[PDB]
């Protein structure tokens, strides 16, 4: 239940993704878990909110992350790759231009087990999650939910 | 099959992070299944 970034593992064992614990709620991408329940030691986390189109899911409570890229500043991907210590990768986002407005995007390509890793602003706030994007090389949207 | 979680770190900005990656501007569409595709 501690705040932080977490590996999402499956059973040998395999890392399928990453997520963010904040304010008692676990946040990850829908395609990582498909809404399955999660074990946390002896405890169980059940899905609470999910949306395939946003590709997000929250456990134990509603989506809590609400910070947004400012459109100008560099950000940091807090990547947690399989088999590797959590590490920060700083970048200037590009932009996904859509009929419903612009979304930040990071042109960084890490293993699929890294999906769900948080993208941070300089204040340390999570502005979205890494791992839903397009191929031009892979480019990931900065995917943020609604609080 | 059961999924489980393991803590991997604090959520913190790191002053000495590696810096890399370009900043492309792309027109895209997002469909009902959550898939982004390119648009022209």
Numbering used by the authors:
A (entry chain B): 18 to 28, 32 to 156, 160 to 170
B (entry chain A): 49 to 88
Copy out sentences from the published article reporting this entry, exactly as the authors wrote them.
Here, we present two crystallographic fragment screening campaigns using a 96 fragment sub-selection of the European Fragment Screening Library (EFSL) provided by EU-OPENSCREEN. The performance of this subset was validated in two fragment screening campaigns using the model system endothiapepsin (EP) and the NS2B–NS3 protease complex of the Zika virus. EP is an aspartic protease with the catalytic dyad formed by Asp35 and Asp219 and has served as a model protein for finding inhibitors for other aspartic proteases like β-secretase, a key target for treating Alzheimer's disease. As a second and real-life target, we addressed the NS2B–NS3 Zika protease which is crucial for the viral life cycle of the Zika virus but with its shallow active site challenging to target.
The protein construct contains the soluble part of the membrane bound NS2B co-factor and the protease domain of the NS3 protease/helicase protein of the Zika virus. The NS2B–NS3 Zika protease is a heterodimer, the NS2B co-factor wraps around the NS3 protease domain and forms part of S2 and S3 pocket. The NS2B–NS3 Zika protease construct was cloned into a pET-DUET-1 vector, with residues 46–96 from Zika gene NS2B and the protease site from NS3 (residues 1–177) (courtesy of Martin Scanlon Lab, Monash University) following the design of Li et al. 2018, with an engineered C143S mutant to prevent crystallographic disulfide bond formation between neighboring NS3 copies as seen by Lei et al., 2016.32,33 The NS3 protease part has an N-terminal His6-tag followed by a TEV protease cleavage site. The NS2B–NS3 Zika protease was crystallized with some optimizations as described by Huber et al., 2022 by mixing 1 μl protein solution (40 mg ml−1 protein in 20 mM HEPES, pH 7.8, 250 mM NaCl, 1 mM DTT, 5% glycerol) with 1 μl reservoir solution (24% w/v PEG 2000, 0.2 M ammonium sulphate and 0.1 M sodium acetate pH 4.6) in hanging drop trays. For soaking of the NS2B–NS3 Zika protease crystals 40 μl of soaking solution containing 0.1 M sodium acetate pH 4.6, 0.2 M ammonium sulfate, 24% (w/v) PEG 2000 and 5% (v/v) DMSO was added to the reservoir. For the second fragment screening campaign LigandFit and PanDDA were used to identify binding events. With this campaign 18 fragments were identified as crystallographic binders with a total of 22 binding events. Out of the 22 binding events 10 fragments are binding in the S1 subpocket of the active site close to the catalytic triad forming π–π stacking interaction with Tyr161. One of the fragments interacts directly with the catalytic His51. Eleven of the binding events are at crystal–contact interface sites.
